[PDB]
Design a protein around this ligand. Structure first.
Ligand SMILES: OC[C@H]1O[C@@](CO)(O[C@H]2O[C@H](CO)[C@@H](O)[C@H](O)[C@H]2O)[C@@H](O)[C@@H]1O
Ligand SMILES: OC[C@H]1O[C@@](CO)(O[C@H]2O[C@H](CO)[C@@H](O)[C@H](O)[C@H]2O)[C@@H](O)[C@@H]1O
Lengths: 273, 273
């Protein structure tokens, strides 16, 4: 009688934290518009991630024919796709994106510098993230660690810590463009790094009586809903049910996954209400 | 397909445990039977709490905790004006004071549903007075008001009962008591959701004119199985949104067998990485 209810509930839940990527080089106003309409369909997902080139299109032109797109956040991807910018150049990409109407910024780290020399890599991350955060202000800055490109768990952990020290509001597992995406292993390392950092942060605030919310974005790429649900379970186990809130958790995925989530959710029989 | 066949049920079960309140209110309860329920409730991950008659509150809070320290981690909700809802506001207030004195964290109070059915106008006034005097003794603790939707005769009566309870100071509207057969849960949830939504609108206006508190919905499902319970969870999100799926605004009440079913499902998920 209630066939499919578990998958339907899971889909509804994932929609609530979903951020769809429209970041390839081949993107056009047409492809981007198609993604934004499905993202903004009631109930709207959290937002869409695009390269700076499509921010004004969504915020100023698309909204004329598709008013609902004003209801989703636009996250601009800076320092993409190789993470080879300088703090100044990346900060300027951010300035332009925010001016065009971006609500959030996702910034890739120079993962190559991390792999050649960890100490220097950490220094570069702190500088990059701090300068970008200065221009982003109170808006959300997600730092993409590119876990799959980092060589070793120690490096991933160090990159996470450096990003936090630089002022990241969110730690994002992968870019959405790369060959590798989240793995249970990488999510685990990121969770531990964040948890340990917050323990130290909260201990200081408590003992000194001083009185930011830091999230984890699991980028799954083009996997299906089943695997995505497994990550959702990992987040709950590692970080608790209270971490499953928009200011602390996001799920990044592709357009096909978004369509799968909507098709699943829409199959729930709502005739009773 | 043979892969990921249990992930959605596992996630749904984990979610339900996060909001679950197990009822141990039968006439035949003994300290031993109550202790058995509390142990399963308190098992990691602990559910929200247990609902018992005032007679078992001191046992759980002072004795049981000596051999089962984990029970300190679950809330104890004491049922008053139970199970008939025909007590006088003064006597019900004394029952509440006694429960709170024994260590109760929350109070579940039934309304005089019979009165609502024989004279709506009179019934509403009795609810306002009962809820108001009980809330006065509960103070800052949570007062859940049981409407006994299955026993009220008609949607108009249910709606009026909900409005009277809200105006009286209820912190939660509960569909049924947790003892006996449950009827019209879906209908009661729908009516309660509407009543609460408009109450919030009117109450905010009322506050501004003087120059609103957190109110929850507790869906008591009875002895139904997990799939039907999940459908009620889905009903709650659909009608009230993802922001309503938080402990301060939502609880699921069910029996001991349902609790065991939820744990067995969740435990099948492999947390080891
Ligand atoms: O542990 C008590 C819990 O068990 C249930 C079964 O789910 O009832 C059992 O225990 C009672 C002892 O109080 C018996 O009266 C009953 O016959 C037995 O099935 C729940 O109803 C109860 O809360
Ligand atoms: O069935 C309603 C009718 O039954 C009485 C007793 O004859 O109460 C019984 O049913 C109630 C609702 O299920 C219970 O609350 C009560 O415990 C049970 O004895 C009447 O009082 C009521 O009008």
């Amino acid at each position: 009688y209630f066939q499919g209810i578990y998958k339907q509930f899971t889909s509804r839940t994932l929609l609530n934290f979903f951020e769809v990527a429209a970041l390839t080089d081949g993107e056009t106003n047409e492809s981007v518009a198609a993604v934004c309409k499905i993202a903004a369909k009631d109930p709207a997902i959290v937002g869409v991630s695009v390269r700076p080139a499509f921010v004004r299109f969504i915020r100023q032109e698309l909204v004329k024919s598709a008013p609902e797109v004003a209801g989703i956040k636009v996250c601009a991807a800076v320092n993409f796709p190789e993470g080879t910018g300088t703090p100044d150049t990346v900060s300027l990409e951010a300035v332009g994106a925010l001016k065009d109407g971006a609500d959030e910024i996702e910034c890739l780290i120079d993962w190559r510098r991390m792999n050649e020399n960890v100490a220097d890599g950490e220094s570069r991350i702190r500088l990059l993230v701090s300068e970008v955060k200065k221009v982003v202000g109170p808006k959300t800055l997600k730092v993409v660690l590119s876990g799959g490109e980092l060589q070793g768990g120690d490096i991933i952990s160090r990159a996470a810590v450096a990003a936090l020290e630089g002022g990241a509001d969110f730690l994002q597992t992968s870019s959405g463009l790369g060959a590798t995406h989240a793995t249970m292993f990488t999510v685990h390392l990121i969770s531990i790094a964040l948890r340990e950092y917050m323990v130290r942060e909260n201990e200081r605030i408590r003992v000194e009586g001083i009185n930011r919310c830091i999230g984890i974005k699991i980028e799954v790429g083009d996997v299906h809903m089943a695997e995505t649900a497994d990550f959702l379970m990992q987040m709950i186990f590692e970080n608790g049910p209270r971490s499953i809130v928009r200011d602390k958790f996001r799920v990044g995925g592709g357009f096909n996954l978004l369509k799968e989530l909507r098709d699943c959710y829409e199959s729930w029989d709502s005739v009773g209400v």
